[PDB]
Structure 1
Amino acid sequence: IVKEGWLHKRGEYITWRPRYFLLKNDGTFIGYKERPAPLNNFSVAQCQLMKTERPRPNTFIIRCLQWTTVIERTFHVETPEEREEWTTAIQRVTMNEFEYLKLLGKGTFGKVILVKEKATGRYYAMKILKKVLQNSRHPFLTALKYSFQTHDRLCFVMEYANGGELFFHLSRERVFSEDRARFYGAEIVSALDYLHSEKNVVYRDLKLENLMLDKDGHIKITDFGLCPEYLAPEVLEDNDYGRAVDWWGLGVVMYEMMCGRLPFYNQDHEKLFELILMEEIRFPRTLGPEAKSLLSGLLKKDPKQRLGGGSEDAKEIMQHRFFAGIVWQHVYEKKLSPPFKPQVTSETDTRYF
């Protein structure tokens, strides 16, 4: 522990709340609602500090590039010498190689472009951020093929699955069978397991929009971050959070696969946030009891009690009844037989673009 004490923190989602922070020698910087393994999401490594006076004097900002995504946390103290304490405490290929084809996403920090590589014909996604790295040896995360820089832009070329978005395949079919969900669920769990233990990283945005299928119908987890129905309670009320957020997410995604609908819904965001924090779930009668058990545990409102939420993390999901007779090393080596294969001949079949 290098320094500690109250700071004001801006509510990343639904404004300012005091919170007791702990900077540490490992890099970590975390805030608890009262005076109280490590995750690289909360680290200060290669971050960039910014004193400022908008929209409240003695404000400061930590901005970090984590992997291919820019992260901002904003704080505010009572006096400038105080802000200053904390501050000090805290401190080839080029664009010509590709065709630009479709705008996959815009946002504040940059753009994501569907791109064909001229020298091979193969399609990737290019993340371009307005102004070293070892990949994850795991097949269902999004791999980074090329990273390069121009004079005003940071460029990241990464896999882009050509098998369709899982949100579309579901919109079409309305609902998934309990065993198709099991297939998707197991790949996701393997992927998040890898991230949690091999990287000490949480994904935080597990939702349907962030899952696609490759040529073979296997899962790909997206890395296209540029900037409610899926937010964990813990995240709403703006606590310390951890690896369990991804399991809350996994429950929501699985709930919607197997019930063809969202576990909590409402047009008004404030009554949605109420529901997330207060309503227990009415599960369908049309639904297997091992499934019910998985979802109930994945969707527990207290992260410490949630399934996957203990010291064992993902091992607690992997050995649930619902996942009986899944060989996990099989999953990792893509040895499961996808139920759905999308309409696609080659890696390059633009049918789904």
Structure 2
Amino acid sequence: KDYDELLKYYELHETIGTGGFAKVKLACHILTGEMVAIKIMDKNTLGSDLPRIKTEIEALKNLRHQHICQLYHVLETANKIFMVLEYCPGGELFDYIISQDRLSEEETRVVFRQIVSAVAYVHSQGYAHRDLKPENLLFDEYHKLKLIDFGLCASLAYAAPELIQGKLGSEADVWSMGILLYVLMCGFLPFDDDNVMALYKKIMRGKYDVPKWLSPSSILLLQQMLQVDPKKRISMKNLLNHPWIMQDYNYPVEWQSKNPFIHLDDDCVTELSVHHRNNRQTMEDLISLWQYDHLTATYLLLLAKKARGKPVRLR
């Protein structure tokens, strides 16, 4: 019944993950043949969370970035909310780290500059992510990273001491990025314990193992990101051009969106109007409402073809 609405536009394939208050399924958008990821949430189960879902959705509508997984379509039915997202066939950074054991400093840098890019942009737009971890970072077709899961934007192992103590959202995301940096280069958490309060204690103390394979510059950067006092912690600003970050690149992290929505793409508009046998101007006007309905999804998925060098064409 709920699925009747979705199945007008998508063929549903297998579940690819489950995360707290949602399951995500692989799917194909019937009109463009593009694969997508559909986040499915039941409104009734966890009904008081629905406000944080609703603001996650509006946040995503204001994020458009080369390292942020794109929202295409929101469908609300009687009992469900369905969010159609850019599909990242490379899967989770988490599983990539498992298979490699740990990344070299060179490859960590490549990956980490993408993460800093996404997060600095999120902050530039006035948000904090607040659940940065390797399950929330995916590899797309080109092995580029895409940040997902804005359900807590405004677990324990990645949470900053000040956030734990209920006391600074920018600074807290930097701490989390430090935990991520550590995990990339080391392949295990800097603070970990079976007992949650003992984990808390270790976080508050700020002491962690420094493995033998870490370079002095890496060790310094970790020290600066993992300051328990947020006032002493490196700020986002200084992370973007940190010497460790700058090694082999020689320019600071490029955080600004490279793909911003300026004017409508003539060719996507033209293809829709021709395909729907509709007046080109009505089509422009209707696309310009930006409802995140099936027309928006189709438009955006055509834009995505264009940016992957595929012909802008409907079937």
Per the normalisation by structure 1, the TM-score is 0.61
Q: Is the 8 A contact 2:129 2:150 kept in 1?
A: no
Deviation of 1:260 (Å): 2.0
2:8 is matched with which residue?
96
2:240 is matched with which residue?
318
Aligned counterparts, 1:154-169, within 5 A: 154-169=81-96
| Paired residue secondary structure (2:178) | helix
1:175 is matched with which residue?
102
Q: Which runs of 5 or more residues in structure 2 are unaligned?
A: 44-56, 260-307, 310-315
Change (3 A) 1:187 1:123: same
| Aligned counterparts of 2:122 and 2:162: Cα–Cα separation in 1 | 20
1:273 is matched with which residue?
200
1:201 is matched with which residue?
127
* Amino acid corresponding to residue 15 of structure 2 in structure 1: L
| Aligned counterparts of 2:21 and 2:251: Cα–Cα separation in 1 | 40
| Paired residue secondary structure (2:91) | coil
1:124 is matched with which residue?
36
* Amino acid corresponding to residue 201 of structure 1 in structure 2: Y
| Aligned counterparts of 1:228 and 1:306: Cα–Cα separation in 2 | 19
2:163 is matched with which residue?
235
State the aligned residue count.
237
Change (3 A) 1:319 1:329: closer
**Which one of 99, 104, 113 corresponds to residue 25 of structure 2?**
113
Deviation of 1:121 (Å): 2.6
| Paired residue secondary structure (1:246) | helix
Deviations 1:258-290 (A, max 9, x none): 122211122222211111112422312321111
Matched, 1:262 2:189: yes
2:49 is matched with which residue?
none
Change (3 A) 1:224 1:112: farther
| Aligned counterparts of 1:208 and 1:163: Cα–Cα separation in 2 | 13
Q: Which stretch shifts more, 169-178 or 123-132?
A: 123-132
1:252 is matched with which residue?
179
Aligned counterparts, 1:301-340, within 5 A: 301-308=228-235, 314-324=236-246, 325-329=250-254, 333=258
* Amino acid corresponding to residue 288 of structure 1 in structure 2: S
Change (3 A) 1:290 1:107: closer
Higher relative contact order (CA 8 A, sep 6+): 2
Change (3 A) 1:123 1:333: same
| Paired residue secondary structure (1:291) | helix
Change (3 A) 1:243 1:269: same
Deviations 1:271-329 (A, max 9, x none): 11111112422312321111111111111111222112xxxxx2210121102213534
Matched, 1:294 2:221: yes
Deviations 1:181-214 (A, max 9, x none): 11111111111111101x2100011111111111
Percent of aligned pairs with the same amino acid: 33
* Amino acid corresponding to residue 190 of structure 1 in structure 2: S
Deviations 1:100-152 (A, max 9, x none): 22224446754332222122332211123333954423111111111222223
**Which one of 204, 215, 222 corresponds to residue 148 of structure 2?**
222
Deviation of 1:177 (Å): 0.7
Change (3 A) 1:276 1:110: same
Per the normalisation by structure 2, the TM-score is 0.68
Aligned counterparts, 1:5-84, within 5 A: none
Q: Is the 8 A contact 2:241 2:252 kept in 1?
A: no
Change (3 A) 1:103 1:258: same
2:75 is matched with which residue?
148
Select the structure that is richer in helix.
2
1:343 is matched with which residue?
none
| Aligned counterparts of 1:279 and 1:137: Cα–Cα separation in 2 | 35
Deviation of 1:333 (Å): 4.6
Change (3 A) 1:206 1:98: same
